Amino acid sequence: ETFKALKEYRCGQSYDECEVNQSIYYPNGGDARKFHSNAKPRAIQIIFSPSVNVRTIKM
Amino acid sequence: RDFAGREQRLFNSEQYNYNNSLNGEVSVWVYAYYSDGSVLVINKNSQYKVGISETFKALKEYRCGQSYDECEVNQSIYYPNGGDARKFHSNAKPRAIQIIFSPSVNVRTIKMAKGNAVSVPDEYLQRSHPWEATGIKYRKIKRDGEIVGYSHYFELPHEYNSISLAVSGVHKNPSSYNVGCCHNVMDVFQSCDLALRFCNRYWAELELVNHYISPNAYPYLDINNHSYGVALSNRQ
Amino acid sequence: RDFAGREQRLFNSEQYNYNNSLNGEVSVWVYAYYSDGSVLVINKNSQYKVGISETFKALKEYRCGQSYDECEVNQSIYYPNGGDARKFHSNAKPRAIQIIFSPSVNVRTIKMAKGNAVSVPDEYLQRSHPWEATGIKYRKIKRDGEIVGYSHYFELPHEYNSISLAVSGVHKNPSSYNVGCCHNVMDVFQSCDLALRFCNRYWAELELVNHYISPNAYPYLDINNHSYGVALSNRQ
Amino acid sequence: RDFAGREQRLFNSEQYNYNNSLNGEVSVWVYAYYSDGSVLVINKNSQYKVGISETFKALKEYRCGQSYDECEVNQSIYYPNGGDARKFHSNAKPRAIQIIFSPSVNVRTIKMAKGNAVSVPDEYLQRSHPWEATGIKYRKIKRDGEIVGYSHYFELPHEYNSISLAVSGVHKNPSSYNVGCCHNVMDVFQSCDLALRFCNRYWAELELVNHYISPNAYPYLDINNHSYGVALSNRQ
């Protein structure tokens, strides 16, 4: 996934968040009205099924 | 005895050489140029081999935060007079494309499928070879006598230039070790999963050079034929 | 014989001392910190004594020019499962609070009522003392060895930290003259009417420091524990 | 020898008695009842004395997340035929009011200023006493023979019942210690700053009883004359 694809999207509920992205790709590159976008993930968890071979996992 | 000097030159040379090793990246970028002066970039970075494939509709200009008519434009491009569009020429169609590869590609492996608007490489499927080997057309992007990238640039200036596009290249490998043979083939399959994609639309080529090409040390060739990138081999 | 020097030092000392006199201001600020990095400030400035009191709803983030769901969030915070909200945690809830007093406060008079979301100080009214004397928790904000303000900072990092908040302090008075006794009591009642309030939401702590704290010569303690303010007593 | 029993009775009695001490809360609630069956509650909780004051406009129904016409309604209520409203009777006007005090009030100190729509207590300012002492009208809200609160209920069923409203009561003090005399007067001034306010609109009296009155152990008297609250003095 891209950076943008991991951000929160609430279907049925954007211009500012486009500029947030621009300001994250390059410092001071965007015209965003916020210091921290709450649509950014705070954490990630990766889970594999027990059928994986753990030694082959790559990130 | 100038060890700072020696280590600076080795640090840059190691970067050059690592990228060109079989442990390093190969990268492709597709730039689509619109009449409003904005530029869409799609980038993919992967080990072993890399490519990008987009539909006609995916290459058209989209300004996030700023559609029914453009849906009908598409219908009228798939089949003549097939849509109910209120415009002769959509300004969301790209006017030109530039394909850039990293210097770690082998240029002889570059392949391009430049289809029509319904995603057929050469008029009808029955007569289509699925790609063309276009490496001979790529120009060297050079800085300080070093090849920093490879460029293919083509205009789509005619009303009939309505395209789907895919491109692919393989990382150089001047060894006789086949990275896709039985010993490593599953690692190539994993590389498909591990490739990282980026896309964004910049309002102007200036913004593209200043905030995308340059900060990332990427190669670029601008509309005035000026080369951008960073030479590293045996350089301080 | 350097009269410019002497007068500069006296001008600053007079400012320090005037503020600490019974003719001077006492000021309180409440800063609420949101997860988007924005900061709401509420300030009150008054003679004799000063305070601020806000409801749970009043402390939540409001971006002017940029609601039904947040109304239901409130209902679900007043009573568990009492609302029809489409979110587990409202990002409009403050994550932290900082209380700052001017150096003219008497720290021993500081009182705080930190209620629950229905404005009850300590679980049920029947068992609530209406305030706590929290002065012992205030840190000195210092510049150049001078106390420029007093700070109490507390996080609300848990889902259950849903608060109403009031704070109050009295201007220092090392005299035995009671400003609230019969000779001056009506002037204290008028001071209630005369207090000036300010509130605003700044997009970042940077903007708060640059455009609110610093231009006004106010004390501040930032999230990196850095002190801001202006030392004036016997200083040029 | 049943110490669990004894301690349970003392725990409840201590709550009853603490609230009635000079260290405890006194609380007032104003309930405004609308024709759609919704109820606005305003609560204030403070030491020593407490009150609420609202304008005519502030008492009208507001459904958050769900105005020009209602602005003109106001104009036509301030002066007859003064507005351009598209309705004879605004359903946002309250139909009734209930004032409830905590049992820690002294009923003889209760005062109410029930003004007209332009906030004048009795027709013209020149002839207005600024309040009426209405304590004799308050009913005891009782549970198990214990007074859990005091209630004044009045309908506004006529088109001309268009009101501004303020109410105030003092915490009981059967001692001869004057809490507002010189030794404690500044603490009463701080209590003004420390009072906590709450307001909310519940869709039905059911929701008000279930999610506001009952969870908080507050007194209430419903439209069927049923009493709610918790008796604590010498009770398990």
Side-chain angles (χ1 to χ4, degrees), chain A residues 1-12 14-59, chain B residues 1-65 67-236, chain C residues 1-65 67-236, chain D residues 1-65 67-236:
Chain A
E1 297 301 335
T2 65
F3 165 77
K4 188 193 187 332
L6 295 159
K7 292 170 73 195
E8 200 172 356
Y9 182 71
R10 314 184 302 168
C11 171
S14 194
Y15 171 72
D16 197 58
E17 286 294 329
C18 190
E19 297 285 338
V20 158
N21 295 340
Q22 311 315 118
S23 257
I24 289 175
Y25 301 147
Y26 186 77
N28 316 119
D31 170 36
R33 290 181 202 160
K34 71 170 77 59
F35 178 92
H36 174 75
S37 171
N38 287 137
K40 300 175 80 195
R42 302 301 300 180
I44 298 290
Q45 187 174 189
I46 308 168
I47 297 180
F48 283 90
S49 68
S51 61
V52 77
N53 178 321
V54 172
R55 299 192 309 118
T56 71
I57 292 169
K58 294 168 178 67
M59 182 171 76
Chain B
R1 255 66 193 293
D2 186 340
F3 296 109
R6 286 158 78 77
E7 289 289 6
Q8 180 70 246
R9 200 178 299 274
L10 285 186
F11 177 75
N12 295 328
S13 302
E14 290 165 9
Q15 294 186 276
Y16 179 81
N17 280 285
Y18 191 78
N19 197 170
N20 283 338
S21 75
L22 309 180
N23 302 120
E25 298 274 11
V26 53
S27 297
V28 61
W29 291 262
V30 171
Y31 293 97
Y33 301 90
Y34 305 107
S35 56
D36 68 1
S38 68
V39 190
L40 166 65
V41 59
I42 307 170
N43 168 226
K44 195 107 71 89
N45 308 306
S46 199
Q47 203 170 3
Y48 308 117
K49 62 99 188 32
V50 69
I52 286 172
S53 180
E54 297 301 335
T55 65
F56 165 77
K57 188 193 187 332
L59 295 159
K60 292 170 73 195
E61 200 172 356
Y62 182 71
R63 314 184 302 168
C64 171
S67 194
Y68 171 72
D69 197 58
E70 286 294 329
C71 190
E72 297 285 338
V73 158
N74 295 340
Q75 311 315 118
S76 257
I77 289 175
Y78 301 147
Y79 186 77
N81 316 119
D84 170 36
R86 290 181 202 160
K87 71 170 77 59
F88 178 92
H89 174 75
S90 171
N91 287 137
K93 300 175 80 195
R95 302 301 300 180
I97 298 290
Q98 187 174 189
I99 308 168
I100 297 180
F101 283 90
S102 68
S104 61
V105 77
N106 178 321
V107 172
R108 299 192 309 118
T109 71
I110 292 169
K111 294 168 178 67
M112 182 171 76
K114 169 158 61 58
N116 71 15
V118 296
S119 303
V120 168
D122 190 11
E123 315 180 350
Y124 291 96
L125 292 168
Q126 291 88 329
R127 65 176 76 155
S128 296
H129 193 225
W131 46 268
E132 301 290 329
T134 49
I136 192 166
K137 297 177 177 186
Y138 282 69
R139 297 195 271 149
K140 298 155 179 178
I141 303 171
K142 293 204 205 194
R143 299 301 313 286
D144 308 305
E146 181 171 300
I147 298 164
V148 299
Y150 296 105
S151 166
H152 186 191
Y153 179 87
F154 52 93
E155 300 162 60
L156 311 167
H158 303 125
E159 201 61 55
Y160 56 89
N161 302 145
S162 303
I163 74 170
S164 48
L165 180 61
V167 64
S168 178
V170 181
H171 192 294
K172 63 171 64 131
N173 180 9
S175 91
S176 42
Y177 185 89
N178 183 342
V179 299
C181 204
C182 299
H183 278 205
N184 194 241
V185 65
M186 291 303 298
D187 281 50
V188 183
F189 276 115
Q190 290 195 272
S191 79
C192 289
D193 292 326
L194 291 160
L196 292 177
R197 174 167 191 295
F198 173 82
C199 66
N200 192 46
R201 186 183 64 94
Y202 294 86
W203 296 351
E205 200 181 40
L206 179 74
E207 197 175 83
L208 180 83
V209 169
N210 294 351
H211 292 172
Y212 184 67
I213 297 299
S214 300
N216 298 310
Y218 297 165
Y220 190 65
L221 184 59
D222 73 13
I223 304 300
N224 291 126
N225 197 48
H226 193 91
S227 290
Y228 301 86
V230 188
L232 297 167
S233 184
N234 203 52
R235 285 147 191 289
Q236 297 176 323
Chain C
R1 255 66 193 293
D2 186 340
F3 296 109
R6 286 158 78 77
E7 289 289 6
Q8 180 70 246
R9 200 178 299 274
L10 285 186
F11 177 75
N12 295 328
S13 302
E14 290 165 9
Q15 294 186 276
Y16 179 81
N17 280 285
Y18 191 78
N19 197 170
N20 283 338
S21 75
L22 309 180
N23 302 120
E25 298 274 11
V26 53
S27 297
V28 61
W29 291 262
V30 171
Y31 293 97
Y33 301 90
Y34 305 107
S35 56
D36 68 1
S38 68
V39 190
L40 166 65
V41 59
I42 307 170
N43 168 226
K44 195 107 71 89
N45 308 306
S46 199
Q47 203 170 3
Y48 308 117
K49 62 99 188 32
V50 69
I52 286 172
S53 180
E54 297 301 335
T55 65
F56 165 77
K57 188 193 187 332
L59 295 159
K60 292 170 73 195
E61 200 172 356
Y62 182 71
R63 314 184 302 168
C64 171
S67 194
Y68 171 72
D69 197 58
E70 286 294 329
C71 190
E72 297 285 338
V73 158
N74 295 340
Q75 311 315 118
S76 257
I77 289 175
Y78 301 147
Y79 186 77
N81 316 119
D84 170 36
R86 290 181 202 160
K87 71 170 77 59
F88 178 92
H89 174 75
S90 171
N91 287 137
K93 300 175 80 195
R95 302 301 300 180
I97 298 290
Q98 187 174 189
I99 308 168
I100 297 180
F101 283 90
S102 68
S104 61
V105 77
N106 178 321
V107 172
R108 299 192 309 118
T109 71
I110 292 169
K111 294 168 178 67
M112 182 171 76
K114 169 158 61 58
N116 71 15
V118 296
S119 303
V120 168
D122 190 11
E123 315 180 350
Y124 291 96
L125 292 168
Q126 291 88 329
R127 65 176 76 155
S128 296
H129 193 225
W131 46 268
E132 301 290 329
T134 49
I136 192 166
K137 297 177 177 186
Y138 282 69
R139 297 195 271 149
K140 298 155 179 178
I141 303 171
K142 293 204 205 194
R143 299 301 313 286
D144 308 305
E146 181 171 300
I147 298 164
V148 299
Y150 296 105
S151 166
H152 186 191
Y153 179 87
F154 52 93
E155 300 162 60
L156 311 167
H158 303 125
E159 201 61 55
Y160 56 89
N161 302 145
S162 303
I163 74 170
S164 48
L165 180 61
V167 64
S168 178
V170 181
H171 192 294
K172 63 171 64 131
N173 180 9
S175 91
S176 42
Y177 185 89
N178 183 342
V179 299
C181 204
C182 299
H183 278 205
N184 194 241
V185 65
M186 291 303 298
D187 281 50
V188 183
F189 276 115
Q190 290 195 272
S191 79
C192 289
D193 292 326
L194 291 160
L196 292 177
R197 174 167 191 295
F198 173 82
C199 66
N200 192 46
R201 186 183 64 94
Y202 294 86
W203 296 351
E205 200 181 40
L206 179 74
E207 197 175 83
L208 180 83
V209 169
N210 294 351
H211 292 172
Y212 184 67
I213 297 299
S214 300
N216 298 310
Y218 297 165
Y220 190 65
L221 184 59
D222 73 13
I223 304 300
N224 291 126
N225 197 48
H226 193 91
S227 290
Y228 301 86
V230 188
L232 297 167
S233 184
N234 203 52
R235 285 147 191 289
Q236 297 176 323
Chain D
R1 255 66 193 293
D2 186 340
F3 296 109
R6 286 158 78 77
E7 289 289 6
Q8 180 70 246
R9 200 178 299 274
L10 285 186
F11 177 75
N12 295 328
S13 302
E14 290 165 9
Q15 294 186 276
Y16 179 81
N17 280 285
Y18 191 78
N19 197 170
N20 283 338
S21 75
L22 309 180
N23 302 120
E25 298 274 11
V26 53
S27 297
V28 61
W29 291 262
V30 171
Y31 293 97
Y33 301 90
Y34 305 107
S35 56
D36 68 1
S38 68
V39 190
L40 166 65
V41 59
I42 307 170
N43 168 226
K44 195 107 71 89
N45 308 306
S46 199
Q47 203 170 3
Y48 308 117
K49 62 99 188 32
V50 69
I52 286 172
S53 180
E54 297 301 335
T55 65
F56 165 77
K57 188 193 187 332
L59 295 159
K60 292 170 73 195
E61 200 172 356
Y62 182 71
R63 314 184 302 168
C64 171
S67 194
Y68 171 72
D69 197 58
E70 286 294 329
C71 190
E72 297 285 338
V73 158
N74 295 340
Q75 311 315 118
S76 257
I77 289 175
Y78 301 147
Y79 186 77
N81 316 119
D84 170 36
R86 290 181 202 160
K87 71 170 77 59
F88 178 92
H89 174 75
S90 171
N91 287 137
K93 300 175 80 195
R95 302 301 300 180
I97 298 290
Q98 187 174 189
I99 308 168
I100 297 180
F101 283 90
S102 68
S104 61
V105 77
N106 178 321
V107 172
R108 299 192 309 118
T109 71
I110 292 169
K111 294 168 178 67
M112 182 171 76
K114 169 158 61 58
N116 71 15
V118 296
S119 303
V120 168
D122 190 11
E123 315 180 350
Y124 291 96
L125 292 168
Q126 291 88 329
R127 65 176 76 155
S128 296
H129 193 225
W131 46 268
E132 301 290 329
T134 49
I136 192 166
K137 297 177 177 186
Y138 282 69
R139 297 195 271 149
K140 298 155 179 178
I141 303 171
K142 293 204 205 194
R143 299 301 313 286
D144 308 305
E146 181 171 300
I147 298 164
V148 299
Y150 296 105
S151 166
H152 186 191
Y153 179 87
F154 52 93
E155 300 162 60
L156 311 167
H158 303 125
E159 201 61 55
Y160 56 89
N161 302 145
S162 303
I163 74 170
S164 48
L165 180 61
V167 64
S168 178
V170 181
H171 192 294
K172 63 171 64 131
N173 180 9
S175 91
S176 42
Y177 185 89
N178 183 342
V179 299
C181 204
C182 299
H183 278 205
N184 194 241
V185 65
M186 291 303 298
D187 281 50
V188 183
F189 276 115
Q190 290 195 272
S191 79
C192 289
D193 292 326
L194 291 160
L196 292 177
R197 174 167 191 295
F198 173 82
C199 66
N200 192 46
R201 186 183 64 94
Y202 294 86
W203 296 351
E205 200 181 40
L206 179 74
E207 197 175 83
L208 180 83
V209 169
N210 294 351
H211 292 172
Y212 184 67
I213 297 299
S214 300
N216 298 310
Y218 297 165
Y220 190 65
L221 184 59
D222 73 13
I223 304 300
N224 291 126
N225 197 48
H226 193 91
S227 290
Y228 301 86
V230 188
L232 297 167
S233 184
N234 203 52
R235 285 147 191 289
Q236 297 176 323

